[PDB]
Amino acid sequence: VKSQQQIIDSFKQANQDQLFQYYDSLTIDQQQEFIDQLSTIEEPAKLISTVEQAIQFSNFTQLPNEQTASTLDLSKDILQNWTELGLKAIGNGEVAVLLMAGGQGTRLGSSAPKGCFNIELPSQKSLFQIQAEKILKIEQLAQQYLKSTKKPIINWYIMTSGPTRNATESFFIENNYFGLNSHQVIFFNQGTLPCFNLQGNKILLELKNSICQSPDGNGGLYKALKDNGILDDLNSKGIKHIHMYCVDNCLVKVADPIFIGFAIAKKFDLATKVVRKRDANESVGLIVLDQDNQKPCVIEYSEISQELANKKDPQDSSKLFLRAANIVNHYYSVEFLNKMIPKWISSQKYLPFHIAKKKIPSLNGEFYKPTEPNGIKLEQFIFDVFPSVELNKFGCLEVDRLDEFSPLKNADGAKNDTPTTCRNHYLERSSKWVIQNGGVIDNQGLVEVDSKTSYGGEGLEFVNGKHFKNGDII
Ligand SMILES: CC(=O)N[C@H]1[C@@H](OP(=O)(O)OP(=O)(O)OC[C@H]2O[C@@H](n3ccc(=O)[nH]c3=O)[C@H](O)[C@@H]2O)O[C@H](CO)[C@@H](O)[C@@H]1O
Ligand SMILES: [Mg+2]
């Protein structure tokens, strides 16, 4: 739309003259490539103004009992009822899953997308394959429940970022989508945001003809859904329910019928899963009620005070007051998304920029890697839109952590959330399932239940009285 010079001028008017410090020494091709990159930034002056306001701008209680439920407390009949509602929805092609895999998992230090990571289970399955097989399995369980001739389809929308896209897609193709239909696995990229200097008023140059940019946070998912036509696809296919989740959880129950059934039974617009907080210092957001506006919301682990994090429950001193840990497992009604996404992406009121100090290798005038944080990355949080839902339309399901949540965040060597803790948890869960179904594991070993065999412990009646050894795959 605008000329090359018009773009340059709009950045200079926004006081970003440093970006053109080496412009004249660049070849014409590098210049054109540079401005093309700058042109993707919609409204520079406004963005910078917003980042600045965000920087110079930086009463909770527990959610009402009416909006919460726990799989630890519900009777089998109630859980079965929800399961059936969930399976029926799946059986009618009304369910889609949305996988957030745009993160670069810096803490883990892997060169490949976290989803490809191998926590070294006997099966050597990557996180992506486990999730793929969970999807295939639940489709089959729904088909069996409804007695369908063919299995229903759960479209799997995978949100990648520029840096994880190629490897991610190439990985699924090389593995033939792990058994799923190629058409049901749909990739789409989330956007990016420019990185700024510590002061937060200047965009950082990565190279002489390139600015630093990073994935705009999982909160950038809503805009990516609209812009990539995913929302249109949901409507086109008649999908009514979508399960959004985090790629790092090796235990995740993708498209959990219990979770979907919970939302349908209660007619929720939005629902989220939580587990009991490990300890005051666990790096997890907490689901709470904002008493000032009487709206549900999440307080991120990095923006909570030690005092609030450590406060004990006044009605039970043995527990932390705020202990509903966010495990990034969200349910959204498609209708709710059709109605709200236009609003959410139209202002910071729902998706404010969160500031993160980072060590960003960039231009000094030469490229370099710092030892101290030299810039900031901007991020929108997926849950910041929660307050916009009506309290009575928001659900919070507490689940069993050992059965549903073991995140891979750190490289081996750390105390928690490592490939080892994930592997151990995965094997312990599998082993518990086998024992409960009468299976005998010799020499106190640990076995692995194949995701191709059981979704969550069901259909394991054949192991009763049967012997297994440490390392077996069932
Ligand atoms: C914002 C957010 O969700 N925070 C949650 C996240 O924290 P945490 O900081 O550990 O995780 P991240 O926000 O980095 O990643 C969450 C998920 O979003 C994806 N992602 C992230 C950034 C991005 O630009 N694009 C993208 O797709 C990641 O691939 C991952 O699947 O998990 C914790 C549990 O482990 C929760 O208690 C936190 O409340
Ligand atoms: Mg309750």
Topology, pairings included?
Elements: H1 4-13, H2 28-39, H3 44-55, E1 60-61, E2 68-70, H4 76-91, E3 95-100, H5 127-146, E4 155-160, H6 162-174, E5 185-189, E6 192-194, E7 196-197, E8 205-207, E9 210-211, E10 213-215, H7 221-227, H8 230-237, E11 241-246, H9 257-266, E12 270-276, E13 286-290, E14 295-299, H10 306-310, E15 312-313, E16 316-320, E17 324-333, H11 334-344, E18 354-358, E19 362-363, E20 367-368, E21 375-379, E22 394-398, H12 401-404, H13 419-436, E23 440-441, E24 467-468
Parallel strand pairs: 2-22, 3-4, 3-11, 4-5, 12-22, 23-24
Antiparallel strand pairs: 1-13, 6-10, 7-21, 8-9, 11-17, 12-17, 13-14, 15-16, 18-21, 19-20
The chain binds uridine-diphosphate-N-acetylglucosamine (UD1) and magnesium ion.
PDB class: transferase
Keywords: Pyrophosphorylase, N-acetylglucosamine, Uridine-diphospho-N-acetylglucosamine, Candida albicans, transferase
Assembly: monomeric
Structure description:
The protein has 474 residues and is α/β, with parallel strands linked by helices. It has two domains: 1-438, Spore Coat Polysaccharide Biosynthesis Protein SpsA, Chain A, CATH 3.90.550.10; 439-474, no CATH class. It has helices at residues 4-13, 28-39, 44-55, 76-91, 127-146, 162-174, 221-227, 230-237, 257-266, 306-310, 334-344, 401-404, 419-436, and strands at residues 60-61, 68-70, 95-100, 155-160, 185-189, 192-194, 196-197, 205-207, 210-211, 213-215, 241-246, 270-276, 286-290, 295-299, 312-313, 316-320, 324-333, 354-358, 362-363, 367-368, 375-379, 394-398, 440-441, 467-468. The strands form eight sheets. The chain has an eight-stranded mixed β-sheet, with helices on both faces. Strands 1-13-14 form a three-stranded antiparallel β-sheet, with no helix packed on it. A three-stranded antiparallel β-sheet has the order 7-21-18, with helices on one face. Helix 4 (76-91) packs across helix 5 and helix 4 (76-91) packs across helix 9. The chain is globular. It is classed as transferase.
